[PDB]
Amino acid sequence: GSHSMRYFYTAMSRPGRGEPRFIAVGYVDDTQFVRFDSDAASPRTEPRAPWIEQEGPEYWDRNTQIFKTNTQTYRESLRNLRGYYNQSEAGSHIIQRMYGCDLGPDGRLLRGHDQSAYDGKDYIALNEDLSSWTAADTAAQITQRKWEAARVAEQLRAYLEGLCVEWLRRYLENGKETLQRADPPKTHVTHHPVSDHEATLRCWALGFYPAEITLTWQRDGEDQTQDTELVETRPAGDRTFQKWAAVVVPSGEEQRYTCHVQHEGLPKPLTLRWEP
C-alpha cells in the first residue's frame, strides 16, 4: 500500500537540428498520467490516464506553463553544462531529471527525491534531508553553488513535503479503482527439452500490477541465483507486466525444482512446479 509520484524530464540537444527537445512524463507508481513534448505540433500537457482527465482547464494550463518554461530553462542549462565540461558545440548531450515523493501505507511522507544526470551519469542530487546537495564532480559543484546561492533546496523541500504529497493523495483517490488495486500474477511453468539429458524450466508471471515482483527458482530448497536466467520485467501494454525466470535442469530431476513468486497482489507467496 505504499505509493510514489515521479516526474521524469529529458532534455536533449541536437546541434544542426534545431533547439533542444524537452520531454516530461509523470507517473503515479507504474502508471503514467501526463506527458509534454516540446516537439509536438502544438506542445501542451496531455492526459495519459483516464483518472486525470477530470482535472479542469486551470490544471492543464498551469502544467503547460510550467513545462513551456522548463523547455527554455533546460535549453540554457544544456549550454551551461557544455561549458562546464569544455565541450564542443558539435555534440548532442542530455540532461535528465527525476523527482517526486514516496508515501508509506499510512499516506505519510517517507522521503522525497530530486536527482539529475548529464549524458547518463549522475550529476547532482538533493540529499534525503531535502536541504543539502551531492555533486558528482567539479562541474556539478558549480551548479551546487548556484543552487545554494538561490535557495533551491528550500523550495524543493516545500514542494516535496507539500504540493507533491497533496496532489499524489488526490490522484490516488481519483484513480483508486486502478492505482489502489494490485493485480496478482498468473503463473505457470513450461518445459522445453534442450538435449537428451537437460531441459529448460521457465516460470512465467503474467498480468500483474504493480511491476515489482520476485521470481526465483530453488533446487532442493536452495536458491539458484547464479544459474537462473531472469528477463527484465516488461509491459504488456494494458497496464500490466510480464516476467519469466528460467533454469536448465537435468532431465529426470525436474521435481527437485520449485519456482517462488512474491507480489503485493498475492496474500500468500506462491510455490509452483512443472506439472507434466
Binding site: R62, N70, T73
Partner: peptide, 14 residues
C-alpha cells in the same frame, strides 16, 4: 502536479 522553483526562469538554470 510538477514543481515550480526559482527566483526567476534564470534561477532554475543549472
Amino acid at each position: 502536479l510538477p514543481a515550480v522553483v526559482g527566483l526567476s526562469p534564470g534561477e532554475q538554470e543549472y
